[PDB]
Amino acid sequence: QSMLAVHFDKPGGPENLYVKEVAKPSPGEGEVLLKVAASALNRADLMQRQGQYDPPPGASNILGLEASGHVAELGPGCQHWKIGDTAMALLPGGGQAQYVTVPEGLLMPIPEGLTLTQAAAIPEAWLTAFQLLHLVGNVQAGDYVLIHAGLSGVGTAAIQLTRMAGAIPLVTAGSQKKLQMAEKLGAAAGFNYKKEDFSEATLKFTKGAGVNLILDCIGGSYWEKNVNCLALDGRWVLYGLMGGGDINGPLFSKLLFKRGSLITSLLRSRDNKYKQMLVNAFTEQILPHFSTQRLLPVLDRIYPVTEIQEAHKYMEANKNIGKIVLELPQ
Amino acid sequence: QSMLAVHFDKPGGPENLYVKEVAKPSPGEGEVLLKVAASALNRADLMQRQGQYDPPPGASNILGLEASGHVAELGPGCQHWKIGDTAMALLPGGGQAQYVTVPEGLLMPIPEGLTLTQAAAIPEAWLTAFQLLHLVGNVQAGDYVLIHAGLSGVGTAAIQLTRMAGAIPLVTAGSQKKLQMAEKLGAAAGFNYKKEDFSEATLKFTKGAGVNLILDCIGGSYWEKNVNCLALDGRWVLYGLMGGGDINGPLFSKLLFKRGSLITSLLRSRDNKYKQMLVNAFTEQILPHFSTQRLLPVLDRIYPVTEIQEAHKYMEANKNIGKIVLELPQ
Ligand SMILES: NC(=O)c1ccc[n+]([C@@H]2O[C@H](COP(=O)([O-])OP(=O)(O)OC[C@H]3O[C@@H](n4cnc5c(N)ncnc54)[C@H](OP(=O)(O)O)[C@@H]3O)[C@@H](O)[C@H]2O)c1
Ligand SMILES: NC(=O)c1ccc[n+]([C@@H]2O[C@H](COP(=O)([O-])OP(=O)(O)OC[C@H]3O[C@@H](n4cnc5c(N)ncnc54)[C@H](OP(=O)(O)O)[C@@H]3O)[C@@H](O)[C@H]2O)c1
């Protein structure tokens, strides 16, 4: 069989996005085929669509870093999961489509009480936020954590995970509205990067001690401000370059002066061993809290997958607060 | 009593250095007074003398980040150490003098068989190298470790400690001679930063995988080269800014692409708790290997403390291979 999948022939704007009848993949050894109910947009999608962000080698060229669905088929050497079981997955790509193969290790249960659509807002944002906060930035209770793009899907995951880890989430965002949501999800403070200097506001908030952890998906444009409000021994976790990757200035002096760590994370390009570790770590540590202090997947808009174009337009606009989810015909 | 101590009234060149009769300090609570036999030069001394590098608050304004000597007196509340016991210490300053107080936790035994003078070449270089390699850069067996200023005192410590940890030390240095020493101390490779591009040579040596750990005391001037030859997941340990602290270019893109960590270490500015931890860690893990695969303090020149001027001149010249040690009249 073939399947319906989000597709763009040439990179460029959202205009290039359509849904196409494409080859339904086949489970290789040790993976399941997920019949996707929903996949969410990630920023990676916009950049991949723009042709800046080629997918990882081995990963499928189809958009979609995550998917919730039903275990359709099973590859050889499986393994726990039944054919029919609803699950969500972190994917290296291929989620904005009706099927996607997933190594069963990365399949996560859909938390009791959540819809497939809500669950589609979890894998990427939350495994990343979790990766950033625990594995990479090593957040401890009492840490002040500065979360940029606070109402990105990752941002909104991070705010909550920061709280869950007993840490103090400070967010930035470019919208009055977004900050309000951030506060509603647990942000101890929200700074509007268009309206004030988040560096001076953070030091204010932290009584000059600064932040132990910066989750930075902006990078360059925010670098001076970031190192400035970094605490001594502060982990500065760079995981996006929305504000460019260029640096011009005394980053080394400034970072060294703060005994700073500029730790970079990518998750998409990681190997299975790492993702399974993360996903096992996440499944044990974080996932159960989507049912219970309860973790809330933050969905902004749901689109049918045929409206991928308008979904990308919408995220390109930075209008979304948390996850834009795309629903696949079944 | 007063004592003879290295001193500079105004910062500037080595010309400003003399030995002066200064106040002999008094052990505060929980510290010992060390009668210094030898102290070594560190680069910190040249910068402190130049007035770039003020000493830590609380620390003495006298040069000398280390000292070997004899426990002269004991403060109240001691934790082990007797008055007369020979010991060496990591110091925040005050070592290039006839006495210096030290929290007994930072006093380390002088390895059986080493002279006080040789021991004076250990604390700083080796506690730093150890800090950099284990606590900060977390070296594992099999790691390729790129050590810049390979025949700095730290460099020469690091080469050996890298080997001890089962890691592969690659060094850079600006001297044909220095590389030879580096090889003699265990450097798997030596690159001459004046004669070749250490980035292309390192990738060559590492068959394109690059280095898991860069001990970088140069920083800016070497940054492009450094991130270039960094391995995936590579810790880039910045602990000096000899080659400037300015960055101009896509460090973030390049680092993020390598899932690099730019981790900065300072040791001088650390609190006692940290230094004791480090020193206990070092004393348990590394110190015994100065007697036994045997760790060799690398002394280049010994000067009497009255020749501090010529010692600083000598280090300012980058002529030293390993530690320039200064001996104090007794
Ligand atoms: N490397 C990894 O492991 C990994 C994994 C997943 C995602 N990411 C990255 O994490 C970030 C968010 O991902 P997502 O898909 O959840 O994001 P999203 O849903 O697109 O939200 C991102 C938000 O970034 C903010 N932003 C954009 N440009 C900015 C700028 N120049 N300065 C300040 N803020 C800016 C916008 O909100 P406001 O301006 O209103 O706050 C935008 O809504 C992206 O950089 C993405 O590339 C990284
Ligand atoms: N932050 C900390 O925790 C800490 C603690 C102790 C020391 N340090 C730092 O570690 C470095 C070495 O300390 P040390 O006292 O052992 O050093 P040292 O005895 O002075 O040796 C340093 C060597 O650096 C090399 N060098 C100088 N400028 C350079 C440049 N622009 N490019 C490349 N190489 C250059 C020179 O040798 P070649 O050019 O011939 O190789 C020089 O001999 C210094 O940067 C010092 O500040 C840091």
Curated annotation (Swiss-Prot), chains A, B:
The keyword Acyltransferase does not apply. Changing residue 53 to A: Loss of enzyme activity. Pfam families: ADH_N (PF08240), ADH_zinc_N (PF00107). It comes from the Eukaryota. GO terms for biological process: NADP metabolic process. InterPro entries: ADH-like_C, ADH-like_N, GroES-like_sf, NAD(P)-bd_dom_sf, PKS_ER, Quinone_OxRdtase_PIG3. It is an enzyme of class 1 (oxidoreductase). The modification N-acetylmethionine is found at residue 3. GO terms for cellular component: cytosol. GO terms for molecular function: NADPH binding; NADPH:quinone reductase activity; protein homodimerization activity; quinone binding. Induction: Isoform 1 and isoform 2 are both activated by p53/TP53, doxorubicin, etoposide and ionizing radiation. Isoform 2 is highly activated by UV radiation. Its EC number is 1.6.5.5. Changing residue 181 to K: In a breast cancer sample; somatic mutation. NADP(+) binds at residues 43, 149-155, 174-178, 193, 265-267, 320. The keyword Acetylation applies. It catalyses: 2 a quinone + NADPH + H(+) = 2 a 1,4-benzosemiquinone + NADP(+). Transmembrane segments: none annotated. Belongs to the zinc-containing alcohol dehydrogenase family. Quinone oxidoreductase subfamily. Homodimer. Catalyzes the NADPH-dependent reduction of quinones. Exhibits a low enzymatic activity with beta-naphthoquinones, with a strong preference for the ortho-quinone isomer (1,2-beta-naphthoquinone) over the para isomer (1,4-beta-naphthoquinone). Also displays a low reductase activity for non-quinone compounds such as diamine and 2,6-dichloroindophenol (in vitro). Involved in the generation of reactive oxygen species (ROS). This is Quinone oxidoreductase PIG3. It comes from Homo sapiens (Human).
